[PDB]
Design an enzyme around this catalytic site. Structure first.
Site, mmCIF file in Angstrom:
data_model
loop_
_atom_site.group_PDB
_atom_site.id
_atom_site.type_symbol
_atom_site.label_atom_id
_atom_site.label_comp_id
_atom_site.label_asym_id
_atom_site.label_seq_id
_atom_site.Cartn_x
_atom_site.Cartn_y
_atom_site.Cartn_z
ATOM 1 N N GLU A 35 5.068 2.193 6.589
ATOM 2 C CA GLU A 35 4.245 0.951 5.910
ATOM 3 C C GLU A 35 4.372 -0.393 6.373
ATOM 4 O OE1 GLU A 35 2.266 1.212 3.756
ATOM 5 O OE2 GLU A 35 2.691 3.018 2.766
ATOM 6 N N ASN A 46 -6.787 -5.217 3.032
ATOM 7 C CA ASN A 46 -7.535 -4.016 2.776
ATOM 8 C C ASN A 46 -9.021 -4.235 2.747
ATOM 9 O OD1 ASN A 46 -5.104 -2.506 2.163
ATOM 10 N ND2 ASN A 46 -5.115 -3.443 0.401
ATOM 11 N N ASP A 48 -11.201 -3.889 0.804
ATOM 12 C CA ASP A 48 -11.644 -4.450 -0.467
ATOM 13 C C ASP A 48 -11.232 -5.848 -1.063
ATOM 14 O OD1 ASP A 48 -9.070 -4.225 -1.398
ATOM 15 O OD2 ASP A 48 -9.558 -2.819 -2.997
ATOM 16 N N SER A 50 -8.280 -6.925 -1.159
ATOM 17 C CA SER A 50 -6.775 -6.941 -1.609
ATOM 18 C C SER A 50 -5.954 -6.916 -0.596
ATOM 19 C CB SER A 50 -6.579 -5.728 -2.509
ATOM 20 O OG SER A 50 -6.570 -4.570 -1.578
ATOM 21 N N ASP A 52 -1.856 -5.834 0.980
ATOM 22 C CA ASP A 52 -0.490 -5.288 1.042
ATOM 23 C C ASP A 52 0.511 -6.229 1.353
ATOM 24 O OD1 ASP A 52 -2.027 -3.218 -0.163
ATOM 25 O OD2 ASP A 52 -1.598 -1.789 1.427
ATOM 26 N N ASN A 59 0.237 -3.438 -3.091
ATOM 27 C CA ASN A 59 -1.005 -4.044 -3.077
ATOM 28 C C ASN A 59 -1.299 -4.965 -4.219
ATOM 29 O OD1 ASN A 59 -3.946 -4.040 -3.075
ATOM 30 N ND2 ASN A 59 -4.193 -2.005 -2.792
#
Ligand SMILES: NC(=[NH2+])NCCC[C@H](N)C(=O)O
Ligand SMILES: NC(=[NH2+])NCCC[C@H](N)C(=O)O
Ligand SMILES: NC(=[NH2+])NCCC[C@H](N)C(=O)O
Ligand SMILES: NC(=[NH2+])NCCC[C@H](N)C(=O)O
Ligand SMILES: [Cl-]
Ligand SMILES: [Cl-]
Ligand SMILES: [Cl-]
Ligand code: NA
Length: 129
Positions: A35, A46, A48, A50, A52, A59
Site C-alpha cells: 500500500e 483515485n 473518482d 477520492s 487514499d 480511502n
C-alpha cells in the site's frame, strides 16, 4: 515516517493488530508494504476524486474527511491528515473498523492481489516480537 519491516510489525502488534479479525501480523505488514512501502505520509488520488491516506492507504470515500470528496462518508470520524502521522494509532484504529466491515482484508485490493494466499509469515520473519 518510513518504517522498517520489523519496526512496523512491532508497532502494529503494540496497537493490537496482530490476529485482529483473524488476520495474522504478516498480513498487515504485507498490506502496508504494498500500500505505502511503509511510508506514513503516502497519499494517492483515485480516479473518482477520492484519495487514499497513510501506511494502509485508507480511502476518503468512506473512512476519513479530507473536505474534497463529494458525497463521501467519514466513518472513522477523523481528518484524513491524521492518517499521515508518524504515530500509527489513528490508522490502526481506522483499519480495525475497515476490516470489520464485512469483506475482511479484501477491502485492500493490494492485499487481495499481492498478499492473500501467500507466505505472509515471511514479513515478520526474524523480528523480535
Ligand atoms: N472504495 C469504494 N467503494 N469506492 C467507490 C467509488 C466511488 C463511487 N462508488 C463512485 O462511483 O464514484
Ligand atoms: N467500503 C464500504 N462500502 N464501506 C461501507 C460501510 C458502510 C457504512 N457503515 C455506512 O453506513 O455507510
Ligand atoms: N485498494 C487498494 N489497495 N488499491 C491499491 C492500488 C494503488 C494505486 N496507486 C492506485 O491508484 O490505485
Ligand atoms: N517472502 C517475501 N517476499 N517476503 C518479504 C520480506 C520478508 C523478510 N525479508 C523475511 O524473509 O523475513
Ligand atoms: Cl504472519
Ligand atoms: Cl468531503
Ligand atoms: Cl474475514
Ligand atoms: Na470522506
Amino acid at each position: 515516517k518510513v518504517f522498517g519491516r520489523c519496526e512496523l510489525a512491532a508497532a502494529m502488534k503494540r496497537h493490537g493488530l496482530d490476529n485482529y479479525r483473524g488476520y495474522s501480523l504478516g498480513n498487515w505488514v504485507c498490506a502496508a508494504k504494498f500500500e505505502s512501502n511503509f511510508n506514513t505520509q503516502a497519499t494517492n488520488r483515485n480516479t473518482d476524486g477520492s484519495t487514499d491516506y497513510g501506511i494502509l492507504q485508507i480511502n476518503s470515500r468512506w473512512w476519513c474527511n479530507d473536505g474534497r470528496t463529494p458525497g463521501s462518508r467519514n466513518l472513522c470520524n477523523i481528518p484524513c491528515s491524521a492518517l499521515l502521522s508518524s504515530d500509527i494509532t489513528a490508522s490502526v484504529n481506522c483499519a480495525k473498523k475497515i476490516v470489520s466491515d464485512g469483506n475482511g482484508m479484501n477491502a485492500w485490493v493490494a492485499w487481495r492481489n499481492r498478499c492473500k494466499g501467500t507466505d505472509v509469515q515471511a514479513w515478520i520473519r526474524g523480528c523480535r516480537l
